[PDB]
Ligand binder design. Structure first.
Ligand SMILES: CCCCCC/C=C\CCCCCCCC(=O)O
Length: 260
C-alpha cells in the first residue's frame, strides 16, 4: 500500500480534462471504472476511445500533453495509481535479460488486480511477491506493444535533472545550475528538454506543479503555503501555472481530493 498511492476522480457526463506540460513525478497508471472516454494525445497527435478495461500508463519524467473526454451520459470514476520508486526498482529486479504514454487493453485479469489496488486491497490482499511479478510482467508486456523500455536505467539524464530539482525545489534554477551540478555541458543535456518539447522555464514550472500536487495529497490545504512550499515566487504565478497545466484552479483540484 505504501508502494502504491491511489486517488479516484469524478468525471461529469461529457466533461473534458485537459493537461498541458504535465510532468510525471513517478510512474502512474489510470483507467475509467465504467462508460467510455476519448483520450487525445497532443504529443503523438492521436486520439482513441477507452473503456473500463483500458489501462493507460504514464512514464516517469515524461511531460504529458493530452485530454480525456467523457463519452458517457453518466458519471465516471477515474482511478489513478502512483507507484513508488522503491516498488518500481523491485520490479526492475524481477525482470531479467521513447513512448511516454502507453495504452493497454486488459483481459479482465490485469484490470481486476489493478482495480483491487485502487480499492485499497480490502477485498483481496495480494502479497508482495504476486504484486511484484504481476506489475513486472505487466510492464514487460506493454514494453513490447510499444517503442522502447518503459522503465529506465536509473541514471538517465532526465532522471538526474528531475531529482536535482526535486531535492531543492525552491532554488532559483538556471541551466548553469544544472550543468554545474551534473558536471555536464548544455549541448549534451539539452536533448532531454528538446525531446520533451519544453524550454527550461517550462520544465522547472512543470516539476514544481507536480510537487504542489504531491503536497496537496499529504493533507495540505493552505493554497497560499503550497505556492511557496513548491518553489513559486508568488501565489498568483503558482495559480496561473497550475491552471495552465491542470486546466483547473489549485483549490479546485484540492477539492477533488475529497471523493464522493
Ligand atoms: C483536472 C483534475 C485531475 C483529474 C485527473 C483524472 C483524469 C485523468 C487521469 C490522468 C492522471 C494525471 C493527473 C495527475 C493528478 C494525480 O497525480 O493524481
Amino acid at each position: 500500500k505504501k508502494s502504491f498511492q491511489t486517488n479516484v476522480y469524478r468525471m461529469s457526463k461529457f466533461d473534458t480534462y485537459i493537461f498541458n506540460n504535465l510532468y510525471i513525478n513517478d510512474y502512474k497508471m489510470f483507467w475509467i471504472d465504467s462508460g467510455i472516454a476519448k483520450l487525445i494525445d497532443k504529443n503523438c497527435l492521436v486520439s482513441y476511445e477507452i473503456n473500463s478495461s483500458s489501462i493507460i500508463l504514464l512514464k516517469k519524467n515524461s511531460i504529458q500533453r493530452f485530454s480525456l473526454t467523457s463519452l458517457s451520459d453518466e458519471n465516471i470514476n477515474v482511478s489513478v495509481i502512483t507507484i513508488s520508486d522503491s516498488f518500481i526498482r523491485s520490479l526492475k529486479s524481477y525482470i531479467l535479460g521513447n513512448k511516454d504514454l502507453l495504452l493497454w487493453n486488459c483481459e479482465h485479469n490485469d484490470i481486476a488486480v489493478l482495480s483491487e489496488v485502487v480499492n485499497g486491497f480490502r477485498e483481496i490482499n495480494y502479497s508482495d511477491e504476486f504484486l511484484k511479478v504481476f506489475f513486472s510482467g505487466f510492464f514487460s508486456k506493454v514494453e513490447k506493444k510499444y517503442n522502447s523500455i518503459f522503465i529506465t536505467d536509473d541514471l538517465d539524464a532526465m532522471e538526474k535533472i528531475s531529482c536535482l530539482v526535486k531535492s531543492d525545489i525552491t532554488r532559483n534554477w538556471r541551466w548553469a545550475d544544472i550543468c554545474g551540478e551534473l558536471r555536464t555541458n548544455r549541448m549534451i543535456l539539452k536533448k532531454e528538454l528538446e525531446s520533451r518539447g519544453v524550454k527550461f522555464r517550462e520544465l522547472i514550472n512543470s516539476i514544481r506543479i507536480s510537487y504542489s500536487i504531491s503536497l496537496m495529497k499529504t493533507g495540505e490545504f493552505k493554497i497560499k503555503q503550497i505556492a511557496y512550499q513548491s518553489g513559486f515566487a508568488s501565489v498568483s504565478y503558482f495559480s496561473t501555472v497550475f491552471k495552465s497545466t491542470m486546466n483547473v484552479a489549485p483549490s479546485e483540484y484540492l477539492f477533488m481530493l475529497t471523493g464522493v
